[PDB]
Design a protein around this ligand. Structure first.
Ligand SMILES: CCCCCCCC/C=C\CCCCCCCC(=O)OC[C@H](COP(=O)(O)OCC[N+](C)(C)C)OC(=O)CCCCCCC/C=C\CCCCCCCC
Ligand SMILES: CCCCCCCC/C=C\CCCCCCCC(=O)OC[C@H](COP(=O)(O)OCC[N+](C)(C)C)OC(=O)CCCCCCC/C=C\CCCCCCCC
Ligand SMILES: CCCCCCCC/C=C\CCCCCCCC(=O)OC[C@H](COP(=O)(O)OCC[N+](C)(C)C)OC(=O)CCCCCCC/C=C\CCCCCCCC
Ligand SMILES: CCCCCCCCCCCCCCCCCC(=O)OC[C@H](COP(=O)(O)OC[C@H](N)C(=O)O)OC(=O)CCCCCCCCCCCCCCCCC
Ligand SMILES: CC(C)CCC[C@@H](C)[C@H]1CC[C@H]2[C@@H]3CC=C4C[C@@H](OC(=O)CCC(=O)O)CC[C@]4(C)[C@H]3CC[C@]12C
Ligand SMILES: CC(C)CCC[C@@H](C)[C@H]1CC[C@H]2[C@@H]3CC=C4C[C@@H](OC(=O)CCC(=O)O)CC[C@]4(C)[C@H]3CC[C@]12C
Ligand SMILES: CCCCCCCCCCCCCCCCCCOC[C@@H](O)COP(=O)(O)OCC[N+](C)(C)C
Ligand SMILES: CCCCCCCCCCCCCCCCCCOC[C@@H](O)COP(=O)(O)OCC[N+](C)(C)C
Ligand SMILES: CCCCCCCCCCCCCCCCCCOC[C@@H](O)COP(=O)(O)OCC[N+](C)(C)C
Ligand SMILES: CCCCCCCCCCCCCCCCCCOC[C@@H](O)COP(=O)(O)OCC[N+](C)(C)C
Ligand SMILES: Nc1nnc(-c2cccc(Cl)c2Cl)c(N)n1
Ligand SMILES: *[C@@H]1O[C@H](CO)[C@@H](O)[C@H](O)[C@H]1NC(C)=O
Ligand SMILES: *[C@@H]1O[C@H](CO)[C@@H](O)[C@H](O)[C@H]1NC(C)=O
Ligand SMILES: *[C@@H]1O[C@H](CO)[C@@H](O)[C@H](O)[C@H]1NC(C)=O
Lengths: 1273, 119, 173
């Protein structure tokens, strides 16, 4: 009722006094719809004029027993105050109190505070401020203290409820004000400035809607406790394994064999300090900061002649890359799990230890780096869906008219829209025809075409504006968009490169007729629509992190600059100013945090840099992942509500195509009319026996074995096959026999099935094609045409022989069926990605076409400073004088749209993007020598592209793929689409292990001492003691480090032997207590196995280090101690569920891995065939190349995660001198030349990374998601 | 390059004076590369007398106006380059300057102390 | 890159023959200055005799009747960093059968460091009148043929047996 708006008065106070007296004699829940900060219930209607911003009776009957009142604000919001006098001095009926209440409730107060905070956040971004900013900071402090004073005067300081200090954000305000006054009067300056960044967090308080977003984020982070515990445990176990295996291995260096003056390694190492001094005794590669790593095994790195391998010195990367201590091993394993620059650690460890140690990296990458990340993603996804479901549930609970009509007839016809769409596509295709070495006539024709197109669009704009009045024209967002584009085009015509690229946004007008391209617009609009608050929180967090990093480390980056750069100049990535600090933070969010953190540590301390970087990583990735999953789920779930019919008013394009097909039918009918007016019993048994033989298990097994043998025989064709002549001859005759076998099988299948049944089958078609290629090759070799051009090139298609196992193996055929089913949506989203990336490719061409050329010293690879050689003419003039000068260009650049596509792919995958960014920010002009960071703010182009393409395009891709998989599963009838029928039974039986009720307790024995031991051993105290003993053993295993004393080694050995005795004794006690009932529990028999393995491993290690010399075997055997610490899973129910989810997802991951191995094998054979002789450059070195099956598989496993593929592709882009030598002679082979094939290389690498993305990411996510929900169910 | 020196140092006649000259360069003080140039001038416009230096070891030129009363009292390895002075005479009143260069740093610092003799 | 292929061991009289001597470096990015000397111990003799030396792109034949006008350089060309040190006999006789040695003298150039190493590779060459066929090739061809015939016989036997069984069952039905 509107009469409840009574003023808070003395009679009200007396009534509250009598009610509190009754409450004292007396020795529920407040209304949620009336709670402060919300709008009044609609039952109360409108506020009468006389009671706004005045003390009113507490509208909630709940507070009728307490001295609390309500002040109402214009805009219908409720602030709940306290009627107790403020500071025990100022009663609620005071002029100061009423004025303060009015000031606080006014909206202009909040507006002023928001403006003040946003203005102060601009002054925060100054590395060194002018001397006059002291007045501005005094003004800011005065405004803040006035706001805090008015709050305290209005609502009391800390006297009872609803006071100033009762709000947690007021704590931050008070801390800010006291810090400001303290640093102003009492006076580390850097720490105080970093505390000044706390005034940015008041944006959350003053901006409405951010407080709830922050609360939701905190509630979401509360849901990740089990996943974080499991992640830490897994990283600790893997770090212990790595510490056991690779301890001290990264300190291997190649040392001089011949020393003068009786000097020894200790004598040399006691005197050297500088890298120039070290380079005289250890082998350094050219332009390297670290000594080359070597190894003592046959498969490790090789020292040059005259150099010997020795363990001495410091670890690479300023000494930060190592497995020497548990802390460094943990850092390395966290780096591996996040896959940040992990290929460098991969190659370093392989070079230092051996190539058989890639199994460790395979296990780590496929067990932690993917499974833990997918678990985190799944848990955050469920947290968001529960939050969203709760939100949905709560929401549920005279002469001019002639021309006007004529042009309305003309310009609104459905054919006009089709013509305009055709013009848009033609204009985009015409703009995509720009390249760097463009002749003047081509430039002229492009200019004329663009002029014609903008004229056409402007004419359409004028016709549509004269067909209907602007009052009706400007009512549609599409017309507003086109109006902006046309007016910008006219402005540019009257007057750049950017405004020329602005017209490219017209391609989005196809979203009306393109259902999938509308999804991209929906995602982008949601990012600034429903989720605008999440985006704003992300932006605020990034700003705060950039400012904090700059304030903490900017001066250090400038003082200690010679520690991180030889020239004593600031590196490419630093935190000396705001823009570069923001770039570092954005790069960390992209996922590159270790290379910059090394320099951070070098300049300003490990502790500080580690703390800041870990905070940035955790919080930024939490918020980014939350936004990503929110966008995905909202756009692909909430948009599906059947709002409006499918094109109720048909689009003009649809009407145009309907009229076109009607006219086509009419023309066809008229033309047809006009032209008509003008003018044996044994053969069936033979087929039956062929079918009986072909369909037999013996035949199938024999053919499968032959397939495996013929596929494995392809791995022997290395570059080392000229040394194996017996194997060469054997493999040739084996090829002949295999061809005969498969021809016979194909003939038998023909006779058994029939031509129609055989040829209406894709597997049979694949087999037929492979055997045809083999037969053609055999015939050509027999006729002597073994080297006839294309015939010789047809021999590289023998790498497709392994493709015959897909039909044979049910798990690979099961996975390929899902891929084939998902192909159409993949094509749709790929087309959308191409259309979206064409805009950025054309813009990049317009910006950087022909500006990546530079004049370099080839000996050093160093660009000449532009003071000398400022252009290509001077570069040539200098080349005529010197001999090692070259006017070089980047291999991957923006010289045309085709190369811009490759540049965009490298930028979006974050592999090789730094070179392109450096060239772009150095670019000056065409035929001009680049200058260092001349175009500094070209980084914004890459930031904007990374966001819009790499983030939103990936969101769309994942959404479409998982939707396709869900639709396939629904079509199958809720059946798993990655598991075989045999695996379904195992899965169903295995699923019942997560719900079996506890069995009957083991009965007590008969013997008295046995019963007493039973009571001792069946105790929670016993279990807890065992758990703490396991933790202590884990700590003793963590303590061990590199270079430790023999005394510490002995004491650690004795401690571990004591732990072994304790665990064996507890196992014996449990055995003698439970009799034979002990072996009825899986965990009990696991403990039994672990005890036996521990004892056997200790004895074997002691034997191998006493009567034998084998450090590698000793290290591998000593891995049996991890079993004693794997037992912490038993008493951890949170992580046991996640491990059960992993166990549940194993069968499908096995099939996916089988298919991945087959694809990797095929690509490896192709790589050895093609890229075995390319020049050793960039990522192709003496150890990681395509010269052997093992090397090729190592490289392919490396780039399965899309790591270093740019550096492997770079040596293959050489096709002409002086990059390569087409007539190079390789000793021991008849192959000539070390040039690459750019087209083959590009196809190879792009296709492999696309396949890897479509398998190892998308199927992994789907399987982990469904099985985590099941394990959770 | 930051050098911390007292603007005015007042000592009594017949007492010992320690001249505080310190710096906080980021890099380690390489004794094979450190450069020190201690100079004394009777006034700001007066010429400077070169009397103490570090090149590879602390070398004291032993000027007649200082006799054998000038020795080294700091430690370059801990960034103190202070110079001691026994029994400060009234003639010792003046301006003392310490110049420090510490490769691989580029900036060159300078610290100035005005020594005053009290009665 | 460089692959150390061994030389053949049988040269036919009156024809040409190439004696392989490939010696690769441990690391392919290092610089070197290599020369070679070939010695030859004819069968029926006990002393190795120097027959040639190649250095700085000039081949120096010692005055030897057995090799005068019959040996040309066939190794790496156009550089001082020799990794293929083969020679080529343009007219093989019965005096070219014996033990050969290929001495390799490599001088690596490092940073403030020079390493002068040496390798020796031994090649035994037996001269014949007719080129013998490879035992590996012979046995491989024989085994391929027997495997083909065995597989075809097994398949034909199974086909005949299954056809007779199917015909009997059909005519019974
Ligand atoms: C919400 C908030 C979230 C974040 C909260 C804070 C999180 C992490 C704090 C990490 C920093 C803790 C240690 C501080 C530094 C310290 O006190 O360092 C002590 C030792 C120093 O060793 P040293 O003398 O050999 O160093 C020199 C070696 N030289 C000469 C070869 C270069 O540090 C070492 O050993 C190794 C130091 C690094 C250890 C690995 C840390 C990896 C953390 C990952 C996060 C996982 C989640
Ligand atoms: C979500 C999305 C994920 C992946 C997106 C795409 C990833 C990147 C894929 C493709 C990269 C293309 C790289 C091609 C490099 C072009 C090199 C070049 O220089 O251009 C070669 C040819 C044109 O011949 P030319 O230059 O020798 O003629 C010169 C004529 N003279 C001699 C008279 C001056 O360019 C051509 O083939 C035309 C351009 C290349 C052909 C393919 C068209 C572009 C995109 C297709 C991807 C489809 C999947
Ligand atoms: C480098 C470091 C190396 C460290 C090595 C440490 C030693 C490792 C030993 C390998 C495993 C040894 C054998 C474990 C057998 C476990 C077992 O007995 O498991 C039985 C269950 C089905 O038990 P149930 O329902 O028939 O009743 C009984 C269970 N109850 C009453 C709880 C429902 O199967 C399952 O969970 C099977 C789950 C298997 C999971 C993988 C185990 C290895 C990792
Ligand atoms: C990275 C991995 C690091 C090491 C992880 C630990 C390895 C050893 C795991 C234990 C081996 C012996 C198992 C003995 C029987 C255990 C057993 O009962 O299995 C079944 C249990 C089920 O547990 P739950 O709490 O009912 O699950 C949630 C409900 N639903 O579920 C489990 O405990 C099964 C877990 C299997 C291990 C994880 C998959 C490995 C592949
Ligand atoms: C919508 C997506 C799938 C692309 C559709 C095709 C076109 C919009 C673009 C994409 C790639 C473009 C081509 C990429 C590169 C070139 C090479 C360029 O010629 C050169 O390479 C010149 C080099 C020289 O003169 O030395 C001429 C334009 C052309 C054919 C481009 C023409 C327009 C293309 C086909
Ligand atoms: C949303 C679509 C339409 C564009 C997305 C990309 C933009 C973020 C890019 C494209 C054009 C770019 C601008 C093109 C030109 C320049 C000049 C450039 O400076 C120079 O070229 C050198 C100036 C000098 O030092 O003299 C600094 C970056 C900047 C502002 C760029 C900033 C980033 C822009 C706006
Ligand atoms: C599921 C699909 C499975 C497909 C399997 C295809 C065949 C898979 C065959 O796998 C083994 C071969 O790759 C071995 O090749 P190598 O060249 O390493 O063997 C010789 C090595 N030495 C002796 C020279 C060192
Ligand atoms: C350079 C040359 C590159 C060549 C690349 C060739 C790629 C080939 C990929 C494998 C492509 C092999 O065929 C894929 C099959 O899925 C197609 O047949 P289906 O499985 O749809 O048939 C029906 C199956 N059920 C439903 C009856 C079980
Ligand atoms: C990515 C990870 C790749 C490696 C995964 C290894 C999983 C290794 C663990 O595999 C567990 C099995 O249950 C699934 O494999 P199977 O398909 O062999 O089980 C059923 C048996 N049949 C179907 C063959 C008869
Ligand atoms: C799918 C999982 C990831 C791919 C796994 C592929 C199989 C695993 C492929 O492993 C290849 C490595 O073993 C090659 O290095 P090795 O040290 O073994 O080479 C020894 C060579 N010699 C010295 C004997 C001649
Ligand atoms: N943005 C982005 N998206 N996807 C990838 C990617 C590509 C291939 C394989 C894998 Cl495992 C990944 Cl994670 C990437 N490197 N960067
Ligand atoms: C080792 O020291 C002795 C003197 O003790 C010296 O004569 C000799 O030259 C030194 N070794 C070499 C080879 O320089
Ligand atoms: C290039 O070099 C040659 C040889 O020094 C010289 O004779 C000639 O004039 C030069 N030509 C140009 C175009 O610089
Ligand atoms: C080798 O020399 C002999 C004798 O001069 C000659 O008869 C024979 O034809 C020569 N063989 C070749 C390959 O020239």
């Amino acid at each position: 009722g509107p009469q409840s708006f009574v003023h808070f008065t003395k009679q009200s106070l007396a009534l509250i006094e009598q009610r509190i007296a009754e409450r004292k004699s007396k020795e529920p829940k407040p209304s949620s719809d009336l709670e402060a900060g919300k709008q009044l219930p609609f039952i109360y209607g409108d506020i009468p004029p006389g009671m706004v911003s005045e003390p009113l009776e507490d509208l909630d009957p709940y507070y009728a027993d307490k001295k609390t009142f309500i002040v109402l604000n214009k805009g219908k919001t409720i602030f709940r105050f306290n009627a107790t006098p403020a500071l025990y001095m100022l009663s609620p009926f005071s002029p100061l109190r009423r004025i303060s209440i009015k000031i606080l409730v006014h909206s202009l107060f909040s507006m002023l505070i928001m403006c003040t905070i946003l203005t102060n956040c601009i002054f925060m971004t100054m590395n060194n401020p002018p001397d006059w900013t002291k007045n501005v900071e005094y003004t800011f402090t005065g405004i803040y203290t006035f706001e805090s004073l008015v709050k305290i005067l209005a609502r009391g300081f800390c006297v009872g409820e609803f006071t100033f200090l009762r709000d947690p954000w007021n704590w931050l305000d008070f801390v800010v004000i006291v810090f400001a006054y303290l640093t102003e009067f009492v006076n580390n300056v850097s720490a105080l400035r970093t505390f000044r960044v706390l005034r940015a967090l008041k944006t959350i308080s003053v901006i409405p809607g951010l407080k709830t977003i922050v609360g939701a984020l905190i509630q979401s982070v509360k849901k990740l406790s089990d996943v974080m515990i499991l992640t830490v445990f897994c990283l600790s176990v893997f770090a212990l394994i790595g510490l056991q295996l690779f301890m001290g291995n990264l300190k291997h260096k190649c040392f001089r064999n011949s020393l003068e003056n009786n000097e020894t390694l200790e004598s040399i190492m006691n005197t050297l300090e500088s890298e120039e001094d070290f380079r005289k005794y250890f082998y350094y590669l050219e332009g390297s900061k670290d000594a080359l790593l070597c190894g003592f095994s046959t498969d490790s790195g090789q020292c040059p002649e005259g150099y010997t391998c020795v363990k001495i010195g410091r670890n690479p990367d300023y000494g930060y890359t190592s497995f020497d201590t548990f802390s460094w091993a943990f850092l390395a394993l966290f780096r591996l799990m996040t896959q940040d620059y992990w290929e460098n650690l991969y190659q370093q460890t392989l070079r230092a230890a051996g190539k058989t140690y890639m199994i460790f990296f395979v296990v780590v990458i496929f067990l932690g780096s993917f499974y833990l990340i997918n678990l985190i993603l799944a848990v955050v996804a469920m947290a968001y869906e529960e939050q969203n479901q709760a939100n949905i549930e709560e929401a549920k609970q005279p002469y001019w008219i002639k021309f006007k009509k004529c042009i309305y007839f003309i310009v609104m016809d459905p054919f006009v829209d089709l013509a305009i769409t055709i013009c848009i596509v033609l204009n985009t295709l015409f703009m995509a025809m720009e390249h760097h070495p463009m002749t003047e006539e081509f430039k002229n024709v492009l200019a004329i075409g663009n002029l014609v197109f903008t004229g056409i669009f402007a004419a359409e704009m004028v016709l549509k504006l004269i067909a209907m009045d602007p009052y009706e024209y400007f009512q549609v967002g599409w017309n507003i968009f086109d109006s902006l584009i046309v007016t910008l085009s006219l402005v540019e015509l009257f007057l750049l490169s950017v405004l020329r690229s602005f017209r490219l946004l017209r391609v989005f007008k196809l979203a009306k007729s393109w259902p999938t391209l509308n999804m991209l617009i929906k995602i982008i609009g949601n990012s600034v629509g429903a989720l605008g608050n999440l985006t704003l929180v992300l932006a605020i967090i990034v700003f705060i992190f950039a400012v904090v990093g700059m304030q903490l480390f900017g001066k250090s980056y400038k003082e200690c600059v010679c520690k991180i750069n030889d020239d004593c100049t600031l590196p490419r990535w630093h935190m000396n100013d705001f823009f570069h600090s923001f770039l570092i933070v954005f790069r960390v969010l992209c996922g590159e945090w270790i290379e910059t953190m090394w320099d951070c540590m070098e300049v300003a301390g490990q502790a500080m840099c580690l703390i800041v970087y870990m905070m940035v990583m955790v919080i930024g990735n939490l918020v980014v992942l939350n936004l990503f999953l929110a966008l995905l789920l909202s756009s692909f779930s909430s948009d599906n509500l059947t709002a409006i019919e499918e094109d109720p008013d048909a689009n003009n394009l649809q009407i145009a195509v309907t009229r076109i097909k009607k006219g086509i039918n009419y023309v066809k009918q008229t033309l047809r009319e006009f032209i008509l007016k003008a003018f044996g019993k044994i053969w069936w048994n033979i087929r039956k026996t062929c079918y009986k033989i072909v369909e037999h298990s013996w035949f199938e097994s024999f053919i499968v074995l032959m397939i495996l043998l013929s596929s494995g025989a392809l791995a022997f064709e290395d570059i080392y096959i000229e040394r194996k002549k017996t194997i060469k001859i054997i493999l040739e005759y084996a090829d002949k026999i295999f061809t005969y076998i498969f021809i016979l099988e194909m003939l038998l299948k023909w006779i058994a099935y029939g031509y129609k049944t055989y040829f209406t089958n894709a597997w049979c078609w694949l087999d037929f094609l492979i055997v045809d290629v083999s037969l053609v090759t055999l015939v050509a070799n027999t006729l002597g045409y073994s080297d006839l051009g294309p015939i010789k090139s047809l021999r590289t298609l023998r790498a497709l022989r392994p493709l015959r196992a897909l039909s044979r193996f049910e798990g690979m055929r099961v996975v390929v069926n899902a891929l084939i089913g998902a192909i159409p949506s993949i094509m749709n989203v790929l087309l959308v990605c191409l259309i979206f990336w064409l805009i950025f490719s054309i813009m990049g061409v317009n910006l950087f076409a022909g500006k990546f050329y530079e004049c370099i010293n080839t000996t050093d690879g160093s660009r000449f400073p532009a003071s000398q050689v400022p252009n290509r003419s001077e570069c040539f003039a200098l080349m005529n004088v010197s001999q090692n000068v070259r006017w070089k260009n980047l291999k991957v650049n923006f010289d045309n749209v085709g190369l811009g596509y490759l540049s965009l792919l490298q930028v979006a995958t974050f592999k090789g993007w730094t070179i392109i960014m450096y060239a772009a920010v150095d670019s000056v002009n065409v035929d001009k020598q680049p200058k260092y960071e001349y175009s500094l703010y070209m980084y914004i182009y890459f930031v904007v592209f990374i966001i819009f393409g790499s983030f939103f395009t990936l969101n769309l891709f994942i959404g479409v793929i998982i939707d396709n998989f869900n639709q396939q599963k629904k079509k199958l009838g809720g059946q798993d689409i990655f598991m075989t029928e045999e695996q379904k039974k195992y899965y169903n039986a295995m699923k019942k292990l997560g719900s079996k009720k506890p069995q009957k307790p083991i009965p007590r024995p008969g013997n008295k001492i046995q019963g007493c031991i039973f009571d001792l051993v069946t105790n929670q105290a016993f279990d807890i003691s065992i758990m703490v003993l396991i933790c202590l053993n884990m700590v003793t295993m963590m303590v061990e480090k590199e270079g430790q004393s023999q005394h510490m080694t002995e004491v650690l050995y004795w401690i571990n032997v004591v732990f072994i005795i304790l665990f064996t004794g507890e196992c014996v006690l449990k055995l003698i207590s439970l009799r034979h009932y002990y072996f009825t529990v899986g965990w009990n028999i696991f403990d039994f196995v672990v005890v036996i393995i521990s004892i056997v491993g200790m004895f074997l290690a002691d034997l191998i280090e006493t009567y034998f010399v084998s450090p590698t075997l000793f290290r591998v055997i000593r891995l049996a101690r991890i079993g004693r610490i794997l037992r912490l899973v038993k008493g951890a129910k949170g992580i046991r569920t996640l491990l059960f989810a992993l166990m549940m997802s194993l069968p499908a991951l096995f099939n996916i891995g089988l298919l991945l191995f087959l694809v990797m094998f095929i690509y490896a054979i192709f790589g050895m065939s093609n890229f075995a002789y390319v020049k050793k450059e960039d990522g192709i070195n003496d150890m990681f190349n395509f010269e052997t099956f093992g090397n090729s598989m190592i490289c392919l496993f490396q780039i399965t995660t899309s790591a270093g593929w740019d550096g492997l592709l770079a040596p293959i882009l050489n096709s002409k001198p002086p990059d390569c030598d087409p007539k190079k002679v390789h000793p021991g082979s008849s192959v000539e030349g070390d040039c690459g094939n750019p087209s083959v290389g590009i196809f190879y690498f792009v296709s492999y990374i696309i396949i890897s993305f479509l398998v190892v990411v998308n199927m992994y996510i789907a399987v982990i998601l469904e099985n985590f929900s099941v394990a959770t169910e | 390059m930051e050098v911390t020196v007292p603007a005015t140092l007042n000592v009594l006649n017949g007492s010992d004076a320690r001249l505080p000259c310190t710096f906080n360069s980021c890099y380690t003080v390489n004794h094979k590369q450190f450069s020190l140039n201690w100079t004394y001038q009777e006034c700001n416009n007066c010429s400077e007398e070169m009397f103490l230096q570090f090149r590879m070891k602390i070398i004291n030129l032993k000027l007649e106006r200082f006799q054998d009363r000038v020795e080294f009292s700091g430690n370059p390895s801990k960034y103190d380059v202070s110079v001691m002075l026994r029994n400060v005479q009234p003639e010792d009143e003046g301006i003392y300057n310490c110049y420090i260069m510490n490769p691989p740093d580029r900036h060159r610092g300078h610290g100035k102390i005005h020594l005053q003799v009290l009665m | 890159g460089c692959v150390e292929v061994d030389s053949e061991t049988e040269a036919v009289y009156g024809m040409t023959f190439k004696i392989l001597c490939i010696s690769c470096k441990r690391r392919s990015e290092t610089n070197a200055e290599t020369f070679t000397e070939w010695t030859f111990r004819q069968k029926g003799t006990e002393e190795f005799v120097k027959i040639l030396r190649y250095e700085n792109e000039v081949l120096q034949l010692e005055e030897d009747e057995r090799f005068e006008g019959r040996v040309v350089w066939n190794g790496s060309r156009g550089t001082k960093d020799l990794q293929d040190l083969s020679i080529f006999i343009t007219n093989v006789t019965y005096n070219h059968s014996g033990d050969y040695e290929c001495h390799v003298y490599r001088l690596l150039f490092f940073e403030n460091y020079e390493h002068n190493t040496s390798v020796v590779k031994k090649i035994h060459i037996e001269v014949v009148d007719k080129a013998n066929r490879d035992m590996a090739s012979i046995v491989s061809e024989i085994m391929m043929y027997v495997l083909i015939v065995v597989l075809t016989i097994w398949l034909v036997a199974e086909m005949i047996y299954c056809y007779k069984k199917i015909a009997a069952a059909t005519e019974t039905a």
